[PDB]
From a paper:
Structural and functional analysis identified IPO as a member of the JRL family but with a different tetrameric association. Four IPO protomers form a compact tetrameric association by swapping their extended N termini from residues 1 to 10. Thus, the wound-inducible protein IPO from sweet potato has versatile carbohydrate binding properties and might play a role in plant defense.
IPO–Me-Man belongs to an orthorhombic space group C2221. The Matthew coefficient and solvent content for IPO–Me-Man had a reasonable value of 2.21 Å3/Da and 44.4% for 2 molecules in an asymmetric unit. This phenomenon might indicate that only a few Me-Man molecules bound to IPO proteins in IPO–Me-Man, which resulted in a higher temperature factor. Nine hydrogen bonds are formed by the residues Gly21, Tyr97, Gly141, Trp142, Tyr143, and Asp145 of IPO and the atoms O1, O3, O4, O5 and O6 of Me-Man. The atom C7 of Me-Man is also involved in the Me…π interaction with Trp142 of IPO. The binding orientation of Me-Man is similar to that of Me-Glc. Me-Man and Me-Glc are epimers differing only at the C2 position, and IPO has no hydrogen bonds for C2 atom. The KA of IPO to Me-Man was the highest, 7.04×103 M−1.
Author numbering:
A (entry chain A), B (entry chain A): 4 to 154
C (entry chain B), D (entry chain B): 2 to 154
């Protein structure tokens, strides 16, 4: 028997939330869907984030609550994610993730979401890429951290 | 800011494998699909396991390889998983998980798969239930461990 | 023979910021002593440099600055019960965002805060019915981040 | 202010079996000393009771049996380089499936195996280009399970 390995982690950032969640697919996590209530002209409220690498490897964090989704944004990442960032602010009594941006060596995706709050940055040791995420969530996305491994 | 929490883990059991994977959905992980090559009368070879809690929260471990799937088994868990077990044996040069069984307080599901190999048992501290899994995988399922939290 | 999966404790945190090295200390027996070392003075401003955690003479960890230091201020905490909460403040020092203040809370007594009362506050609480049995974080010249290992009482 | 996510090292293992308490020790500085304590005798059979890991006098952990023990056999290992691999054997002792043998390997030297050469073998290797900077596991009266924390050289 050869001992199995578990990827290093960066984070989480954010606050304690109802449930722990973790998603680290074998294949490149390359598609993210952000869902919000509200509207662009009257502030977008991040409710849930859906991460996937393909049709049968996907997770939805936050969005457990009844609040109807009004707006969705699909992001297709074509490269290796090396950092994510965003803002944290209160929403209906909880400190949640309100905006998020993803950064690869080539380009940047976002920020998506609200514009106010306290900033967070999840970076990883040089020579690595982000291959999964974990955090705390319930009706909203409370905390988030990333799994990383060598490029 | 209130520090986020991360669930305890039991395992992994098995051997090092190409890629680390992790799946801990917010909602009850209640459906498992086991896919095999071969056949019941000539030995079933576990190739991949698909875990899910609903249509948009699912992961497939193993099954990256070309080997065509010939047989699938769907298991619907209606309760709280407290333990899993199975056998580990060699398959085309790798020590992989060859059979698996899931045990709840009410009933047991399986074993499913081959019948030979060295046994493994993933149990958890009393008063807890399994809410996710993690492990190593590539073409096959190399290692597996579980995330647990209070019932 | 038989592989019977081993368990790892749940975690709360880390909070703070990325630091040089990752560190971890979860001893088998109860933590019962914490030594905080600072430059400066309480009459003025205390600069938290290192934290020494231990459960006994042969189970101890030192995180944060350990190199050369002249006359330093020390604070020794002797814990009696189960630590259930930790808090403090984070702020910048010599170019690094480090833990500047820290307070340890058990059901029996509250210890601290110790240090400089300025910066962003942090709080490490754990699920009811649990106890903190270890800590982990990042550290270099100072204490950059910290989190806690917990398990059921 | 700003939350800059802290990093935690990758892990290899644990191997062995479930034990009483989870334990963890990842010191900032290089491990450089390991003390193994056994009942029995090398001329006969050595029963591994505890492992003491340390990087210096103020960074040490003791896992496994610590209670009363008469005359015990000791083995002190002084590590020089980066530990890259650990191995040993697991077998039953007084009703528990514990670590019975262990060997530590660095690029410069191999230390062990130490203990009883019987039972199921285990091997903790890490991804090429990395080094072991800590260990974790389960322990009680004996050493039940062990795994390693690793990071890039
Ligand atoms: C509305 O309450 C729910 O959702 C929030 C936020 O996501 C969680 O913190 C909380 O524990 C519940 O799950
Ligand atoms: C066939 O090789 C691939 O699949 C095996 C098993 O699942 C992994 O161990 C290996 O690293 C590769 O990913």
């Amino acid at each position: 028997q050869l001992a199995a390995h578990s990827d290093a982690r960066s984070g989480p950032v954010g606050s304690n939330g109802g449930q722990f969640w973790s998603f680290r697919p074998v294949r490149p996590l390359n598609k993210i869907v952000l869902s919000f209530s509200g509207s662009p002209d009257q502030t977008l409220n991040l409710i849930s984030i859906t991460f996937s690498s393909n049709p049968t490897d996907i997770i939805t964090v936050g969005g457990v609550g009844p609040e109807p989704l009004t707006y969705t944004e699909t992001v297709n990442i074509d490269g290796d994610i090396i950092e994510i960032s965003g803002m944290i602010a209160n929403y209906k009594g909880y400190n949640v993730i309100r905006s998020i941006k993803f950064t690869t060596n080539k380009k940047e995706y976002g920020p998506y979401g609200a514009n106010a709050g306290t900033p967070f940055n999840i970076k990883i040791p040089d020579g690595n890429k982000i291959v999964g995420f974990f955090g705390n969530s319930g009706w909203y996305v409370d905390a988030i951290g990333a799994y990383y491994t060598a490029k």
